[PDB]
Every structure is written in C-alpha cells, then in structure tokens.
Amino acid sequence: MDIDNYRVKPGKRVKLSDWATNDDAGLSKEEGQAQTAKLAGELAEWQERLYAEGKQSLLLILQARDAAGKDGAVKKVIGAFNPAGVQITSFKQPSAEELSHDFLWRIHQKAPAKGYVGVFNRSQYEDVLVTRVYDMIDDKTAKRRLEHIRHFEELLTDNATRIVKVYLHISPEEQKERLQARLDNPGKHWKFNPGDLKDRSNWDKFNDVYEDALTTSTDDAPWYVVPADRKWYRDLVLSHILLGALKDMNPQFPAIDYDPSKVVIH
Amino acid sequence: MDIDNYRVKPGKRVKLSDWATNDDAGLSKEEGQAQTAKLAGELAEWQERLYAEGKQSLLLILQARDAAGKDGAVKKVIGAFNPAGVQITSFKQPSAEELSHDFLWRIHQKAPAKGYVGVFNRSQYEDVLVTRVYDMIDDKTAKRRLEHIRHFEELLTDNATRIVKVYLHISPEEQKERLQARLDNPGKHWKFNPGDLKDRSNWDKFNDVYEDALTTSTDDAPWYVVPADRKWYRDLVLSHILLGALKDMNPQFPAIDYDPSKVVIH
C-alpha cells in the first residue's frame, strides 16, 4: 500500500470512476484491524507532541455521502487522540445569523488553535456541493466560492495549520446495503431520514460537483480519495494519512526557562 | 470504598483531612485497571445514547492541585467517549476581555449543549480559590460568588444539565514525588515550572477555600472527593461516577414516526 496513490495530484482533474471503492491492499480484515490498532498508539504519541509544542495545528476536513463512514471514522481514528487536544465541528444547515455573513464566516471561527487537531465533519465545501445540486447558487458563484476556499486554506497554511482533506469514496450498492441496514435494525432507527434518499437520487450530479471541489488539491492542502467500502480499510488509510501528516509536522517538545538541577522541592 | 462515601453530603461542613488519599477498595492495580477498561465500553454506549437523544447533557467539573491527575483523568476516562460528543475546556487565567465581564460570563459560554458531555478542567470555582489565597478578593466577595455559582448550577440543572463536581485528593508527599519525578526525567522537564511550587507552599490555605467551596454540594450538584494517590483508582472511581450519572439520566434512542417496512430504497 502506497497512501500517495489516494492523493489527488495538483492540477489533474478527477473522474471518480477512476478510483476504486473497495481496495484492501492485499490485507485481511484482521490484518488491517491489527495494523490500525498499532497506529492508534502512534497517533496518540504524536498528537501529544503537537499539543506540547503549541506551534502548529492539523485540520482534517471530512466530506462524504450518507452512510459513507465519516461519523464512524471519527469514532475510531480520531478517538485515538486525547480529546482535550481535539475540536470537532459538524456543520449543519446555516443558521440565520450565519447566512447574514459570508459563507466562510462560520467556518473561520472553527479554525483550530495552535497545538490542536481540528476536524470538519462537512465543511466549507458544502457551500459548493449541495448548494449546486439544488441550484441555490449558479456556476459563476460556485467557481468564485472555490477561489475563496483556496485563499482561505492558504491563510491557514501560512498560520502553520496543516490542511488535510479526505473524501470517503463508496459505491451506490454499498450505500444501499448500509442504508437498508439502518432500516432493518431497530437500534439504528435514528441516523436515517427521508432526505438521504433525495441526495442519493442525485448521485451523478454529486459526482460532478465533488470533482470540481477536488480541484483545490495542492501540495500544501491535498485531497485524498479513500476507498471506504471496507470500513476497516477506511480506518486504516485514514490512520496512515493523519500519522504521516503529524510526523511531517515533526512537533518538538517545548523548551524550558529553568535549570532542573538547581530546583529544590520543599 | 463505596463511591457514595466520597460524596460531600448537603449542608455539612467537611474537612478534606477526613478522607484518605490512597484508597483501593480492596483491589490490586491489575484488577482495578481491568474493571476500568470494562466500564469504558459502558461509558461509550451511554454517551452515544445521550448524543442520539439530544435532550440532556453532562457537565463534569474537575478541580485539583498540581500533579493530582486532572489531565490523566481526562485522557483515560473521558477518552472512552466519542470525541464528537464531548467538549473539554481548560479555563486559563482570565484574559482582558473576560475580566471586563462578570466571572461567570466566560464559564456560561462553555455550558454544554443538549446531547453533549462538557468538562471544565479548572472551572468557575477558580474564582473563589486562587483569588482568595492571594488576596485578590475578600471574604464578603468570596461568599457572594459561591452563591452566584449555586444559582448558576441551578440554572443548568433545570436545563437538564447533570452537574458533577470532582475534587482529586492526593497527599502532599505524593505530589512531591510526582513533581520530583518530572525534574529527574529529562523527557518530562517540560511539564514542570518552578511557578507550580507557589500553590504548594499555600497548601493549608487551599484546604480552607476548597472546604468552603465544597459547601455548594447539593443532591443535584454534588462534590466528590476522590482519593487519587493511586492513578488507577482515580480513573476507576471517576468512571463509576460518570457512568452512574449517565445511567440515572437514562437517555433513550429517539423513536421514529415512519415505518421502515414501507420505504423502498432505489
């Protein structure tokens, strides 16, 4: 497995049909879950360094369709982090006050602080995805919003915020099984709403608008297309993506302004 | 050993000296760690129900002296929760803007929303503890602020926010060893600063103000004195306190007003 195969290279447009949805890198579910359990300890060690250093931050942006596994990815992979060094925002429909501001006003407020890991379950890209499929905004407006999103991600990059954007890529048949699974089990009768089905019927248009959203992939702010049909593979690949980012960020523990040998505890 | 022995009963002044700091309830470190790891699964299930229900919230207030184990309690115990349904705030020294407001202004802003677990690592009580030991406020002001905190906690209690206040209770010798261990270990020099030694030299003055603060213990908003000399016991007792609270809150998965048998996914 080369994780870089899943990175949208700069300047190269995307046709989601070209990325697989059910990769497994030649591993069994047990071999994958075991490797994920090991990376969890690594993710915890490096997130502590990030927080102790207090110079950098990591922003994970999760975008995916219903039942693709973003809530399940947060619970497993992001759960390896110390919750005191993490901030998770799930952006719902814009409120009245939020609509009275530019579309990035509410997004910028949740940008992560130094030393923290930030996660955007749904993010600023919602304003050029669902807003286009249902013709709330026109193509002219959408392209201009995409330019504003790049400039926004560039601002955070110069602020030492390492941006990582991940798209969870699943097939329609897999979603159908997962959605039917919510309807089948009496305990999950609450993550399904007549409205997930509306977006599903617009599968092909979401392919197009996502392909547009993915053109923001740069060296400093990359998009990753993660085959998510196998939940354990989603978790494993996301673990590799975040750990490699933290290792490249290479946080160091902070200096001290005292001589430990001269300290006498009374 | 019974966790209710650790609850500050309403209307009765207490002295922290009455509680031992190194309880173990008749358990070894291994057996205790084993049961803690088991309760973590229950904490996860009930926290998920709390978040699905979206009607109640849980507010944990952590107060303790340096090296007593607040950060470790959060990492182990609160780490069992799904980080997407938890908010941790470590209230630092009041900034300028915060000082231009009443002392509960910044505290109230972090009150947990419906369905969330909130943790105050240092909290509103800081404003009647360190402020008194160093003569920043007089007894008259200190007394009145304790009343304002009660009314505030009553407000949140009527909001379905279950308040739980925990004081981690360690011996001075234990602290000394923990602090010396950070001076001795090079990898931990960054966790010690000679400033921490100021409050330690005022130990008995913190007894008084803490014993005053514990008088806000009610049936609805109880204080717990957790013997924390044994880090594994701290984690175990904290897990029991939070799990009992979530179980008493008894959050229910939300019902549905549609028949899953009548919906066909295309």
Short mmCIF file of N, CA and C in Angstrom, two decimals, chain A residues 52-172:
data_model
loop_
_atom_site.label_atom_id
_atom_site.label_comp_id
_atom_site.label_asym_id
_atom_site.label_seq_id
_atom_site.Cartn_x
_atom_site.Cartn_y
_atom_site.Cartn_z
N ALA A 52 1.96 19.67 23.12
CA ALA A 52 3.03 20.17 23.98
C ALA A 52 3.80 21.29 23.30
N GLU A 53 4.02 21.18 21.99
CA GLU A 53 4.79 22.20 21.27
C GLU A 53 4.01 23.51 21.17
N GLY A 54 2.72 23.44 20.86
CA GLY A 54 1.90 24.64 20.79
C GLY A 54 2.29 25.60 19.69
N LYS A 55 2.86 25.10 18.59
CA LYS A 55 3.19 25.93 17.43
C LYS A 55 2.34 25.65 16.20
N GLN A 56 1.89 24.41 16.01
CA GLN A 56 1.20 24.01 14.79
C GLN A 56 -0.19 23.47 15.12
N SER A 57 -0.93 23.13 14.07
CA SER A 57 -2.24 22.52 14.20
C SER A 57 -2.51 21.68 12.96
N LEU A 58 -3.49 20.79 13.08
CA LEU A 58 -3.88 19.89 12.00
C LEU A 58 -5.38 20.01 11.79
N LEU A 59 -5.79 20.26 10.54
CA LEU A 59 -7.20 20.40 10.19
C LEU A 59 -7.58 19.30 9.21
N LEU A 60 -8.41 18.37 9.68
CA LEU A 60 -8.96 17.31 8.85
C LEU A 60 -10.37 17.70 8.41
N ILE A 61 -10.60 17.69 7.11
CA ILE A 61 -11.89 18.04 6.54
C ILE A 61 -12.48 16.77 5.95
N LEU A 62 -13.59 16.31 6.53
CA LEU A 62 -14.28 15.10 6.09
C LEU A 62 -15.46 15.50 5.22
N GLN A 63 -15.48 15.00 3.99
CA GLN A 63 -16.61 15.17 3.08
C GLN A 63 -16.99 13.81 2.53
N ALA A 64 -18.27 13.48 2.59
CA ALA A 64 -18.72 12.18 2.11
C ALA A 64 -20.24 12.17 2.10
N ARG A 65 -20.79 11.15 1.45
CA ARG A 65 -22.23 10.98 1.32
C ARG A 65 -22.77 10.18 2.50
N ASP A 66 -24.09 10.11 2.59
CA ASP A 66 -24.72 9.47 3.73
C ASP A 66 -24.27 8.02 3.85
N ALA A 67 -23.96 7.62 5.08
CA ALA A 67 -23.55 6.26 5.41
C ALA A 67 -22.18 5.90 4.83
N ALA A 68 -21.40 6.90 4.42
CA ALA A 68 -20.07 6.63 3.88
C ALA A 68 -19.05 6.32 4.97
N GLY A 69 -19.28 6.80 6.19
CA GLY A 69 -18.47 6.40 7.33
C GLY A 69 -17.66 7.50 7.98
N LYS A 70 -18.10 8.76 7.85
CA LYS A 70 -17.35 9.84 8.47
C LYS A 70 -17.56 9.86 9.98
N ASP A 71 -18.79 9.65 10.45
CA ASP A 71 -19.01 9.53 11.88
C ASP A 71 -18.29 8.31 12.45
N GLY A 72 -18.27 7.21 11.70
CA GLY A 72 -17.56 6.03 12.15
C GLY A 72 -16.05 6.17 12.04
N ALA A 73 -15.57 6.99 11.10
CA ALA A 73 -14.14 7.26 11.01
C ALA A 73 -13.68 8.13 12.18
N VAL A 74 -14.50 9.11 12.57
CA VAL A 74 -14.16 9.95 13.71
C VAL A 74 -14.10 9.13 14.99
N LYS A 75 -15.07 8.23 15.17
CA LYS A 75 -15.14 7.48 16.42
C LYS A 75 -13.93 6.56 16.60
N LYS A 76 -13.42 5.99 15.50
CA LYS A 76 -12.33 5.02 15.57
C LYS A 76 -10.96 5.69 15.48
N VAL A 77 -10.74 6.48 14.44
CA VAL A 77 -9.41 7.04 14.20
C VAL A 77 -9.18 8.27 15.07
N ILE A 78 -10.10 9.24 15.00
CA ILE A 78 -9.96 10.45 15.81
C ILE A 78 -10.09 10.13 17.30
N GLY A 79 -10.72 9.01 17.65
CA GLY A 79 -10.80 8.60 19.03
C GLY A 79 -9.48 8.18 19.64
N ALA A 80 -8.45 7.96 18.81
CA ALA A 80 -7.13 7.65 19.33
C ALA A 80 -6.46 8.87 19.96
N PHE A 81 -6.90 10.07 19.59
CA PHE A 81 -6.32 11.30 20.12
C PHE A 81 -6.86 11.57 21.52
N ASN A 82 -6.08 12.33 22.29
CA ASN A 82 -6.56 12.85 23.57
C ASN A 82 -7.66 13.86 23.30
N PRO A 83 -8.89 13.64 23.78
CA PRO A 83 -9.98 14.57 23.43
C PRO A 83 -9.72 16.00 23.85
N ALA A 84 -8.81 16.25 24.79
CA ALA A 84 -8.50 17.61 25.21
C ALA A 84 -7.65 18.36 24.19
N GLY A 85 -7.14 17.67 23.17
CA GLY A 85 -6.38 18.32 22.12
C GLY A 85 -7.06 18.23 20.77
N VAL A 86 -8.39 18.11 20.78
CA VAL A 86 -9.17 17.92 19.56
C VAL A 86 -10.40 18.80 19.62
N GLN A 87 -10.80 19.33 18.46
CA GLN A 87 -12.03 20.10 18.33
C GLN A 87 -12.76 19.63 17.07
N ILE A 88 -13.97 19.11 17.24
CA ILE A 88 -14.74 18.53 16.15
C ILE A 88 -15.99 19.37 15.93
N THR A 89 -16.19 19.80 14.69
CA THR A 89 -17.35 20.60 14.30
C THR A 89 -18.07 19.89 13.16
N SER A 90 -19.37 19.66 13.34
CA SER A 90 -20.21 19.09 12.30
C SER A 90 -21.14 20.19 11.80
N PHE A 91 -20.85 20.71 10.61
CA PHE A 91 -21.59 21.85 10.08
C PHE A 91 -22.92 21.39 9.51
N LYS A 92 -24.01 21.88 10.11
CA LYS A 92 -25.36 21.58 9.67
C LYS A 92 -25.84 22.70 8.74
N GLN A 93 -27.15 22.85 8.58
CA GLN A 93 -27.68 23.91 7.73
C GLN A 93 -27.31 25.27 8.33
N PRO A 94 -26.88 26.23 7.51
CA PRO A 94 -26.56 27.55 8.06
C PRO A 94 -27.74 28.15 8.80
N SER A 95 -27.48 28.67 9.99
CA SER A 95 -28.49 29.38 10.75
C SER A 95 -28.73 30.76 10.13
N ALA A 96 -29.67 31.50 10.72
CA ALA A 96 -30.00 32.83 10.21
C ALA A 96 -28.82 33.78 10.34
N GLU A 97 -28.20 33.82 11.52
CA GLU A 97 -27.06 34.71 11.71
C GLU A 97 -25.91 34.32 10.80
N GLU A 98 -25.71 33.02 10.59
CA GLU A 98 -24.62 32.58 9.72
C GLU A 98 -24.88 32.96 8.27
N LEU A 99 -26.13 32.88 7.81
CA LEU A 99 -26.45 33.29 6.45
C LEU A 99 -26.29 34.79 6.25
N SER A 100 -26.39 35.58 7.31
CA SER A 100 -26.19 37.02 7.21
C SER A 100 -24.72 37.41 7.12
N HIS A 101 -23.83 36.43 7.01
CA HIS A 101 -22.41 36.66 6.81
C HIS A 101 -21.95 35.87 5.60
N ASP A 102 -20.74 36.17 5.13
CA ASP A 102 -20.16 35.37 4.06
C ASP A 102 -20.13 33.90 4.48
N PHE A 103 -20.07 33.01 3.48
CA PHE A 103 -20.20 31.59 3.77
C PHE A 103 -19.01 31.03 4.54
N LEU A 104 -17.87 31.72 4.55
CA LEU A 104 -16.71 31.28 5.31
C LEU A 104 -16.66 31.88 6.71
N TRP A 105 -17.60 32.76 7.06
CA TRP A 105 -17.60 33.38 8.37
C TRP A 105 -17.70 32.34 9.48
N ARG A 106 -18.66 31.42 9.35
CA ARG A 106 -18.83 30.38 10.36
C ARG A 106 -17.70 29.37 10.32
N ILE A 107 -17.11 29.16 9.14
CA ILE A 107 -16.02 28.20 9.01
C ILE A 107 -14.77 28.72 9.70
N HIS A 108 -14.42 29.98 9.43
CA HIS A 108 -13.20 30.55 10.00
C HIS A 108 -13.23 30.54 11.53
N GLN A 109 -14.41 30.71 12.13
CA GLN A 109 -14.49 30.73 13.59
C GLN A 109 -14.01 29.42 14.20
N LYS A 110 -14.18 28.31 13.49
CA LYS A 110 -13.84 26.99 14.00
C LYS A 110 -12.47 26.52 13.53
N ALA A 111 -11.69 27.38 12.89
CA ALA A 111 -10.32 27.03 12.56
C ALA A 111 -9.58 26.66 13.84
N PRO A 112 -8.72 25.64 13.81
CA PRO A 112 -8.12 25.15 15.06
C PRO A 112 -7.04 26.09 15.58
N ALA A 113 -6.90 26.10 16.90
CA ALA A 113 -5.88 26.90 17.56
C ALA A 113 -4.56 26.13 17.61
N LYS A 114 -3.48 26.87 17.85
CA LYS A 114 -2.16 26.26 17.90
C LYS A 114 -2.14 25.11 18.89
N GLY A 115 -1.52 24.00 18.48
CA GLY A 115 -1.41 22.82 19.30
C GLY A 115 -2.56 21.84 19.20
N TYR A 116 -3.61 22.17 18.45
CA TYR A 116 -4.84 21.40 18.43
C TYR A 116 -5.01 20.66 17.11
N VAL A 117 -5.80 19.59 17.16
CA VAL A 117 -6.29 18.89 15.98
C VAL A 117 -7.74 19.31 15.77
N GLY A 118 -8.05 19.77 14.56
CA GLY A 118 -9.40 20.17 14.20
C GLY A 118 -9.97 19.26 13.13
N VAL A 119 -11.27 18.98 13.23
CA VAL A 119 -11.95 18.10 12.29
C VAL A 119 -13.23 18.79 11.83
N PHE A 120 -13.42 18.88 10.52
CA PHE A 120 -14.62 19.46 9.93
C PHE A 120 -15.42 18.32 9.29
N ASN A 121 -16.37 17.78 10.04
CA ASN A 121 -17.34 16.82 9.51
C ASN A 121 -18.36 17.63 8.71
N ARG A 122 -18.26 17.56 7.38
CA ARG A 122 -18.86 18.56 6.50
C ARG A 122 -18.14 19.89 6.74
N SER A 123 -17.91 20.66 5.69
CA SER A 123 -17.01 21.80 5.80
C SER A 123 -17.45 22.88 4.81
N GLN A 124 -16.53 23.80 4.49
CA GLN A 124 -16.83 24.88 3.55
C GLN A 124 -17.20 24.36 2.17
N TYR A 125 -16.83 23.11 1.85
CA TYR A 125 -17.16 22.56 0.54
C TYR A 125 -18.64 22.26 0.40
N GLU A 126 -19.37 22.16 1.51
CA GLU A 126 -20.82 22.04 1.41
C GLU A 126 -21.42 23.20 0.63
N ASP A 127 -20.80 24.37 0.71
CA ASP A 127 -21.30 25.57 0.04
C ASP A 127 -21.02 25.58 -1.46
N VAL A 128 -20.42 24.52 -2.00
CA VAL A 128 -20.24 24.39 -3.44
C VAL A 128 -20.60 22.97 -3.87
N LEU A 129 -21.27 22.23 -2.99
CA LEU A 129 -21.73 20.89 -3.30
C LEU A 129 -23.25 20.85 -3.31
N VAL A 130 -23.86 20.73 -2.13
CA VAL A 130 -25.32 20.66 -2.06
C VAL A 130 -25.94 21.94 -2.60
N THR A 131 -25.24 23.07 -2.49
CA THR A 131 -25.77 24.33 -2.99
C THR A 131 -25.85 24.36 -4.51
N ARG A 132 -25.04 23.56 -5.21
CA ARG A 132 -25.09 23.49 -6.66
C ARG A 132 -26.08 22.45 -7.15
N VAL A 133 -26.12 21.28 -6.50
CA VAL A 133 -27.01 20.21 -6.94
C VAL A 133 -28.45 20.68 -6.97
N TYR A 134 -28.83 21.56 -6.05
CA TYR A 134 -30.20 22.06 -5.96
C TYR A 134 -30.31 23.52 -6.39
N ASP A 135 -29.32 24.00 -7.14
CA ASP A 135 -29.41 25.29 -7.83
C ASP A 135 -29.76 26.43 -6.88
N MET A 136 -29.20 26.38 -5.68
CA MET A 136 -29.25 27.54 -4.80
C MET A 136 -28.25 28.61 -5.23
N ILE A 137 -27.15 28.19 -5.86
CA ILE A 137 -26.16 29.11 -6.41
C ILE A 137 -25.83 28.65 -7.83
N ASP A 138 -25.36 29.59 -8.64
CA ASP A 138 -25.03 29.31 -10.03
C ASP A 138 -23.55 28.95 -10.18
N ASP A 139 -23.20 28.44 -11.36
CA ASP A 139 -21.82 28.05 -11.62
C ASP A 139 -20.86 29.22 -11.43
N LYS A 140 -21.25 30.40 -11.91
CA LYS A 140 -20.43 31.59 -11.71
C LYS A 140 -20.11 31.78 -10.23
N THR A 141 -21.14 31.72 -9.38
CA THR A 141 -20.93 31.89 -7.95
C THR A 141 -20.09 30.75 -7.37
N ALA A 142 -20.33 29.52 -7.83
CA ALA A 142 -19.62 28.38 -7.28
C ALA A 142 -18.12 28.49 -7.53
N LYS A 143 -17.73 28.79 -8.77
CA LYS A 143 -16.30 28.91 -9.08
C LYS A 143 -15.65 30.00 -8.24
N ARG A 144 -16.35 31.12 -8.05
CA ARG A 144 -15.79 32.18 -7.22
C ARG A 144 -15.68 31.73 -5.77
N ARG A 145 -16.64 30.94 -5.29
CA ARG A 145 -16.54 30.41 -3.93
C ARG A 145 -15.36 29.45 -3.81
N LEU A 146 -15.09 28.66 -4.85
CA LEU A 146 -13.94 27.76 -4.80
C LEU A 146 -12.63 28.54 -4.71
N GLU A 147 -12.54 29.67 -5.42
CA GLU A 147 -11.35 30.51 -5.32
C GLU A 147 -11.21 31.07 -3.91
N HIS A 148 -12.32 31.48 -3.29
CA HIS A 148 -12.27 31.94 -1.91
C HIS A 148 -11.84 30.83 -0.97
N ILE A 149 -12.22 29.58 -1.27
CA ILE A 149 -11.85 28.48 -0.39
C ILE A 149 -10.35 28.23 -0.44
N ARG A 150 -9.75 28.30 -1.63
CA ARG A 150 -8.30 28.16 -1.74
C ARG A 150 -7.60 29.24 -0.92
N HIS A 151 -7.97 30.50 -1.14
CA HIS A 151 -7.38 31.60 -0.39
C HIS A 151 -7.53 31.38 1.11
N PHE A 152 -8.67 30.85 1.53
CA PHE A 152 -8.88 30.54 2.95
C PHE A 152 -7.91 29.47 3.42
N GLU A 153 -7.78 28.39 2.65
CA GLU A 153 -6.86 27.32 3.02
C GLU A 153 -5.41 27.78 2.96
N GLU A 154 -5.10 28.74 2.09
CA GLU A 154 -3.76 29.30 2.05
C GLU A 154 -3.46 30.12 3.30
N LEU A 155 -4.45 30.89 3.77
CA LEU A 155 -4.27 31.64 5.01
C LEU A 155 -3.89 30.72 6.16
N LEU A 156 -4.65 29.64 6.36
CA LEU A 156 -4.37 28.73 7.46
C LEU A 156 -3.03 28.04 7.29
N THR A 157 -2.62 27.76 6.05
CA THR A 157 -1.33 27.11 5.83
C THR A 157 -0.18 28.01 6.30
N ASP A 158 -0.24 29.30 5.96
CA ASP A 158 0.75 30.24 6.47
C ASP A 158 0.64 30.46 7.97
N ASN A 159 -0.44 30.01 8.60
CA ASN A 159 -0.61 30.08 10.05
C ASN A 159 -0.13 28.81 10.74
N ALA A 160 0.53 27.91 10.00
CA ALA A 160 1.05 26.64 10.50
C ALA A 160 -0.05 25.61 10.70
N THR A 161 -1.22 25.80 10.09
CA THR A 161 -2.29 24.81 10.13
C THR A 161 -2.11 23.86 8.94
N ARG A 162 -1.78 22.60 9.23
CA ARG A 162 -1.59 21.59 8.19
C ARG A 162 -2.97 21.10 7.75
N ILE A 163 -3.34 21.38 6.51
CA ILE A 163 -4.67 21.06 5.99
C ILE A 163 -4.62 19.68 5.34
N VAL A 164 -5.61 18.84 5.66
CA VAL A 164 -5.78 17.54 5.03
C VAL A 164 -7.26 17.34 4.75
N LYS A 165 -7.61 17.15 3.48
CA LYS A 165 -8.99 16.98 3.04
C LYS A 165 -9.18 15.56 2.56
N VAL A 166 -10.20 14.88 3.09
CA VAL A 166 -10.43 13.47 2.82
C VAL A 166 -11.85 13.28 2.32
N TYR A 167 -11.99 12.62 1.17
CA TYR A 167 -13.27 12.22 0.62
C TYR A 167 -13.42 10.72 0.78
N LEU A 168 -14.49 10.29 1.44
CA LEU A 168 -14.77 8.87 1.62
C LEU A 168 -15.56 8.38 0.41
N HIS A 169 -14.99 7.42 -0.31
CA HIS A 169 -15.46 7.02 -1.63
C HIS A 169 -16.07 5.63 -1.54
N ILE A 170 -17.40 5.55 -1.64
CA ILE A 170 -18.11 4.28 -1.60
C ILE A 170 -19.02 4.18 -2.81
N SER A 171 -19.42 2.95 -3.12
CA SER A 171 -20.26 2.65 -4.26
C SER A 171 -21.73 2.81 -3.91
N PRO A 172 -22.59 2.96 -4.92
CA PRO A 172 -24.03 3.06 -4.62
C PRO A 172 -24.61 1.80 -4.02
#
